Amino acid sequence: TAQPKQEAYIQSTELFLQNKYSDVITTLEDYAPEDMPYVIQYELASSYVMTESLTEEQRQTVSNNITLKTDEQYMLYWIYIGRSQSEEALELARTIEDRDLIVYALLKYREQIKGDTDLSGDEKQKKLDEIDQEIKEYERERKESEAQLEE
Amino acid sequence: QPKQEAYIQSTELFLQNKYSDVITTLEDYAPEDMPYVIQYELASSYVMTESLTEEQRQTVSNNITLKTDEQYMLYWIYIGRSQSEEALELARTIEDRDLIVYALLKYREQIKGDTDLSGDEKQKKLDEIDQEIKEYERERKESEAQLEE
Ligand SMILES: [Cl-]
Ligand code: NA
Ligand code: NA
Ligand code: NA
Numbered sequence A: 001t002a003q004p005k006q007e008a009y010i011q012s013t014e015l016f017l018q019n020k021y022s023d024v025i026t027t028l029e030d031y032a033p034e035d036m037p038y039v040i041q042y043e044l045a046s047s048y049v050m051t052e053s054l055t056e057e058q059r060q061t062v063s064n065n066i067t068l069k070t071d072e073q074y075m076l077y078w079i080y081i082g083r084s085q086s087e088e089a090l091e092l093a094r095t096i097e098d099r100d101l102i103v104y105a106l107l108k109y110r111e112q113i114k115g116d117t118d119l120s121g122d123e124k125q126k127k128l129d130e131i132d133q134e135i136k137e138y139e140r141e142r143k144e145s146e147a148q149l150e151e
Numbered sequence B: 001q002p003k004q005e006a007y008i009q010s011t012e013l014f015l016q017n018k019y020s021d022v023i024t025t026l027e028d029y030a031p032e033d034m035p036y037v038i039q040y041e042l043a044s045s046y047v048m049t050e051s052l053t054e055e056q057r058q059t060v061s062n063n064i065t066l067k068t069d070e071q072y073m074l075y076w077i078y079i080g081r082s083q084s085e086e087a088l089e090l091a092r093t094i095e096d097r098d099l100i101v102y103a104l105l106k107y108r109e110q111i112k113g114d115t116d117l118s119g120d121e122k123q124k125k126l127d128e129i130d131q132e133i134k135e136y137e138r139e140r141k142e143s144e145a146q147l148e149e
Helices: A004-016 A021-028 A038-050 A056-061 A072-082 A086-096 A099-115 A121-149 B002-014 B019-026 B036-048 B054-061 B070-081 B084-094 B097-112 B119-144
Strands: none
Touching (some): A021 A038, A021 B119, A038 B119, A056 A099, A056 B054, A056 B097, B002 B019, B019 B036, B084 B097, B097 B119
């Protein structure tokens, strides 16, 4: 006997050890990240983070380093970002209290609002505006932090 | 000739910061044939509507000036238009590491969603891009601290 999970873990390990990020991702796509062994969370999260379209600036800004010392929450954050579950990544970021991760998740959430088809134009616009205001607030906080550190 | 009027309307929109309106005004036209200043308008408009903080948008677009080479403007227009293959080829021609890496990542996504490619061809392409990305990442880490000596 059926142990499809057991097998996918071995399979993702084989692909990861070869840097086959995309293939790791599709191997694991039907599986809940919260129940994965820590090494498998590591493989998946690394795979998502390695393939996230970040500019050099974004890259400098966000906590996108993943190691076998990195806390589970950071791995879950990047896995949800990777799966386009920005709502889930947003509330993780807030729990973590990582400013730039909240901002990054707010940006992905903005896109999802922009594309949402169930929302009317007015509810749409209101929400984008709420988001941009929150982003600007955090951006203001980052700037003031950097100002104090240069004093 | 409606082309000329599009350039004029895109200018009218650009000067009001109506970046997304600039983009739609020019959507049908080829970027290579556009006058330098319109390439600037379009490139800037794509950058100003990317998913980035305001500060990040400023940082990229403040680097795009009317003394900037046409190539950097074409790069951003391709990115903005999801012509990531084209952005990548240009990026390698420019020989700027950062633009190659960003374009690879966006190209990866183009492949990921390409309907014409078969199941197996898609995967082999992604496998290749994935390995290249690891290679750039390994070089990134090595530059950060060479640990000599
Ligand atoms: Cl993917
Ligand atoms: Na490989
Ligand atoms: Na970083
Ligand atoms: Na500029």
